[PDB]
Amino acid sequence: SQGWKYFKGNFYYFSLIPKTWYSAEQFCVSRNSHLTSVTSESEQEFLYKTAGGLIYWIGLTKAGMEGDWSWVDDTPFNKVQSARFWIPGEPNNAGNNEHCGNIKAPSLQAWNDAPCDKTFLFICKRPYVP
Ligand SMILES: [Ca+2]
Ligand SMILES: [Mg+2]
């Protein structure tokens, strides 16, 4: 694709077609990428500003028996440093059925937990590799 956007060593694809969380991830994997992780304030800002107020699936999903949040691209999840990135009151596990996460609010406090079977646009991430 020519639509990939560049920021700090990584390329990002903002989809034009909505998919479920896992179908989105599979699309990313077919393009040599994963649903995006978020590992700094600057990256969170780039993503929510680029999202322009629309909801995008990101790589947030539950893992292990505790149900701690994790990144599908296998970036270790930093719970301490990620607290600042959830919309206040989230993750709220509405209906006991919200096991995936998206960028929802256009703010540094952007993330929401939503049902994985919901269809949203999505964001892939790919490190530049020469
Ligand atoms: Ca929620
Ligand atoms: Mg697309």
Swiss-Prot record:
Cysteines paired by S-S bonds: 28-124, 100-116
Domain named C-type lectin: residues: 7-125
Where does this polypeptide localize?
Membrane
Note the effect listed for residue 69 to R: In BIRGD; abolishes mannose-binding ability
Result after altering residue 93 to D: Significant reduction in mannose-binding ability
Expression across tissues is:
Exclusively expressed by Langerhans cells. Expressed in astrocytoma and malignant ependymoma, but not in normal brain tissues.
Assembly behavior: Homotrimer.
Disease listed for this protein: Birbeck granule deficiency: A condition characterized by the absence of Birbeck granules in epidermal Langerhans cells. Despite the lack of Birbeck granules, Langerhans cells are present in normal numbers and have normal morphologic characteristics and antigen-presenting capacity.
Supply the domain comment: The C-type lectin domain mediates dual recognition of both sulfated and mannosylated glycans.
Purpose of the protein: Calcium-dependent lectin displaying mannose-binding specificity. Induces the formation of Birbeck granules (BGs); is a potent regulator of membrane superimposition and zippering. Binds to sulfated as well as mannosylated glycans, keratan sulfate (KS) and beta-glucans. Facilitates uptake of antigens and is involved in the routing and/or processing of antigen for presentation to T cells. Major receptor on primary Langerhans cells for Candida species, Saccharomyces species, and Malassezia furfur. Protects against human immunodeficiency virus-1 (HIV-1) infection.
Per its record, how is this protein called by name? C-type lectin domain family 4 member K
Taxonomically, what lineage is the organism? Answer: Eukaryota, Metazoa, Chordata, Craniata, Vertebrata
Q: Name the gene.
A: CD207
Q: Which residues of the full protein are shown?
A: 196 to 325 of 328
